[PDB]
């Protein structure tokens, strides 16, 4: 068995060895919880970055920074890939987790997931539950928890509190913008479950995703991190048997795309903030089916679209 | 002295240690030899793939895959570069040991051919031979060879069969795309050296090559892996002194370039040839002549034949 | 506190591990000094300009070598980022000690300076100092350090001469295009703060530039390598406040950009004092402000004037 706990956990340790190097704090609370602050009220790092999406994908995946251009401008670009993406990606990476605790709330990424079975669903669909006692959470928050939310992850879990570790970073920092592009795999592989694809037909993927610009506040940056994906992530995916359904992978399929996100958010506050769930999605995929050895081609890139998001100015 | 033998079996050793991770099996024979199965009853991996080609390589390459675009479509890349491409390339690469024990067959590749010397004149050529206790083999092939296969390459190596390693994937599979693609520098030092240049005058090179879906077959996947080098392969090469005849390395020059491989294979009949093997060369190289200080490039790339052999479909 | 020369000498401790390999040769001087040739009376490698390149940045920046495309001719290219530019670049990379001992010429770079402290208004700048008793120079050299010039770099540094280890490679050598072009972010870093603007408002850099073929001398490869980085240079960086100033960071807003600077350099005589210090420069930049959340672009690519200075002969 893979254990994404287990895996994540070294992971988690590495980090803890090159605090100083990698811009990040953690603290011990006093129940033996790690909290390790990787944005928060500290800068953070490209490497803390990389770190944190590879302890969300449970150790299961390639994560690197390679620098290319679109159009000319300069990027930072996540490259990556996984041979266990309904693990790596539905059982660890997706954001499936509220915690709520009194008044404590963020939405838990990462392996912790996969002891908590958060949500139930999810475990069922794919055949994974992991069997560990450490537990290894991502949280996007702009706030650390406390003893509390962390007695409450370990409970759940089923993990003592001196066992439970937690990634922190708000969305508008060099670590979230690289742990949301980081996500350009799971994006596919999310998106393809949602509209009924069964994700144990799914072999690997291979994600390509410009990393955003840091914005001005959380808010633009949750715009401009998930647009990365939307309208400039490509995804090259293996799979055992093509369904035609999968030409409804790409974003600009919902009737909702076409503008940034953040516009698309501000325009729903008019509309009890509606949004077709279907728009969170890859901008283009390649499908390499095995059953007859074809490779489907669906979406487009858009980096009209993107310059707008990134808040870009030309000369 | 730099033992392509001992190199490779720490590599395989560390195959050993992450086998689920990289979904690959091994089994250690009654004789001891330890037995890889990377592709045939197993899925394989992205990173089996990497690890498959630095032990092809004789542990002398760095070898990658970064996510990339052709016309706009994703697809993974092996990016790779030697200083030591005569020995890593010629020396251990090259599918050079034809294996025939009876009833098992296999193209061997991999640095077990620097001690059986296969073919002589290579090691001539190149200047090289190892001296190891140790070999290791690798075989694209659709079976998994048993104690007597592994008996005879031990043998044909002057090692005990206990001390002998085989990684064994198919054509067709993801092992099988990276592990070929990830000859794109390979090519155009067997190419060179087929054309009359000395393989003693070249001091590097670095290499780029998309990595081929995989296809139906192993008949149809020899032909899309072949073209990914072929139509879509480039290398930048270093050589000490420069000759004219490279302007014959790029396989446009071939009176058979043209159609996709598979096509060629299977339309003057045969099962080889004549086919031209000067076909078997990179679509495109740059040569930086260390002599008159110039950098001659020579071929081209050809996306709407690669887009035939990978079966793509276009909406 | 971040150890420049602690951090980079772990790294010559592992390049000293495998010197066939990288094609070096190192020799313990009579006073006890290390100096590792990476390139004058040896090839050197690619790895071996990537090590050399992370030392010239104390260990602080993640290097890495892609092959990729311009105008279809395939090159290889540094890809690097760091979380730390100001002490990894100024503190560091720059080749800010002119080091003239008798006769011996050499320009020092890397963690040495943090010690030596040359020049001293770097070091306040960026408020900066090194306190390690080992000291890891890296020289661009044509002849190797002999004991009398380790003696003067370590009492400059205030380090017993046991204590010293020098990396040594001249301009035209593989190690020299791959550390030269290394130094994207760090000219991007430097040119900023020469325009006035201060270095402790840099976050992070990460940047991609082509590495020169070797040109036939020393002189040829000085305009080359300097061309990579000023014709096809990219970097992006985040800044806490943005300053308009930026716009004149790019080579090409300097009187002297143009022609290769092979060209520029004959013209003005060999003599540096006759050149715009402000053409030292990255080719084109994206520049992401954290207090507005713009992200503005300038500069421009050059492949003709590339190709020129890299001496390409097309068919």
């Given at each position: 068995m893979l254990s994404v706990?287990?895996?994540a956990a070294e992971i988690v340790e590495d980090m803890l060895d090159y605090e100083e190097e990698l811009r990040i704090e953690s603290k011990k609370l006093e129940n033996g919880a790690i909290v390790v602050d990787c944005g928060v009220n500290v800068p953070g790092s490209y490497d803390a970055g990389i770190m944190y999406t590879q302890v969300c994908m449970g150790g299961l995946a390639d994560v690197d920074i390679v620098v290319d251009t679109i159009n000319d401008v300069p990027?930072?670009?996540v490259t990556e890939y996984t041979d266990h993406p309904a693990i790596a990606c539905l059982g660890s990476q997706k954001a499936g987790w509220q915690i709520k605790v009194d008044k404590y709330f963020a939405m838990?990424?990462?392996?912790?997931?996969?002891?908590?079975?958060?949500p139930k669903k999810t475990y069922e669909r794919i055949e994974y539950e992991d069997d560990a006692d450490v537990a290894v959470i991502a949280l996007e928050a702009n706030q650390l928890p406390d003893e509390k939310v962390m007695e409450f992850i370990a409970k759940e879990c089923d993990v003592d509190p001196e066992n439970v570790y937690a990634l922190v970073a708000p969305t508008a920092?060099?670590?979230?913008?690289?742990?949301?592009?980081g996500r350009i795999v799971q994006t596919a592989i999310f998106?393809?479950?949602?509209?009924?694809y069964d994700p144990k037909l799914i072999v690997s993927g291979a994600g390509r995703c410009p990393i955003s610009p840091i914005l001005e506040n959380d808010l633009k940056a949750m715009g401009s991190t998930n647009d990365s994906m939307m309208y400039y992530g490509s995804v090259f995916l293996?799979?055992?048997?093509?369904?035609?359904?999968?030409?409804?992978?790409?974003?600009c399929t919902s009737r909702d795309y076409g503008k940034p996100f953040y516009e698309i958010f501000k325009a729903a506050n008019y509309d009890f903030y509606?949004?077709?769930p279907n728009l969170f999605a890859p901008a283009q995929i390649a499908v390499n089916d095995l059953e007859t050895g074809k490779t489907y081609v669906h979406g487009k890139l858009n980096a009209e679209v993107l310059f707008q998001s990134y808040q870009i100015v030309l000369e």
């Open positions: 706990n287990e895996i990027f930072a670009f838990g990424s990462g392996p912790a997931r996969a002891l908590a079975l958060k920092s060099i670590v979230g913008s690289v742990q949301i592009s998106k393809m479950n949602e509209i009924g293996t799979v055992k048997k093509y369904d035609e359904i999968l030409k409804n992978v790409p974003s509606k949004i077709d």
